[PDB]
Amino acid sequence: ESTNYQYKIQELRKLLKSLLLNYLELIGVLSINPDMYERKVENIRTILVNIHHLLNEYRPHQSRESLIMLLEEQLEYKRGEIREIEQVCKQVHDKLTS
Amino acid sequence: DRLTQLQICLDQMTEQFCATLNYIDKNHGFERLTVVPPEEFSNTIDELSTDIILKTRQINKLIDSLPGVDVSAEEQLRKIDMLQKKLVEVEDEKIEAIKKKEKLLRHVDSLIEDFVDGI
Numbered sequence: 001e002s003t004n005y006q007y008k009i010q011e012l013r014k015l016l017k018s019l020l021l022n023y024l025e026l027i028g029v030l031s032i033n034p035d036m037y038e039r040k041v042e043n044i045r046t047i048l049v050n051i052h053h054l055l056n057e058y059r060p061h062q063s064r065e066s067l068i069m070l071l072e073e074q075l076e077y078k079r080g081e082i083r084e085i086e087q088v089c090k091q092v093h094d095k096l097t098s
Numbered sequence: 099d100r101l102t103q104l105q106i107c108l109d110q111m112t113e114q115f116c117a118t119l120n121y122i123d124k125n126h127g128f129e130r131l132t133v134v135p136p137e138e139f140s141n142t143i144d145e146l147s148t149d150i151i152l153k154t155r156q157i158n159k160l161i162d163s164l165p166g167v168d169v170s171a172e173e174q175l176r177k178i179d180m181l182q183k184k185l186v187e188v189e190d191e192k193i194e195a196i197k198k199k200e201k202l203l204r205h206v207d208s209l210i211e212d213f214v215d216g217i
Binding site for chain 2: 002003005006009012013016019020023026027028029034037041044048051052055056058059060061062064065066067068069071072074075078079081082085086088089092
């Protein structure tokens, strides 16, 4: 079973709008009857929570992108180390032929 | 250092989403449907509301930049595997090179040693 993250990001993007609207109402930008006011506050707390659990569940997939980022990085370093050794051998050829 | 800079960036919002509800609570903001004039309040509420909209934007642009979104756990698990391998290969290449260079060096040194005057 793949813990589909393309999905987790969907939600995350949703909760975010949902969180923004709900805040837009609490403030008064959007209209809402006062017997809801506190439910808005309810929703914001709950929203911000779920979001946390998401980003929370996203670290594994995050970790991998980091490894794949390190390996990439060091692999590029070593490659460079060789191409640097190579140069020297070429400069020794130049320096030898003058 | 991204999923956490996101997470990090998302605390601020939680902080400003309380740094607001505080005002609204501690200034009878509920009664808006020593006291702060109906102007100051609004200037304040807008000063925060607006600030929070900008955070919402930022948090997305970041979620978009967030790495790994599109990719699978498998598409990654191999990509790592590969890099692991292509990495060994490159070190053996590095080793070899190093050796060959040191041999070259030994050659040069030998030469230089035989040009010396004094026993």
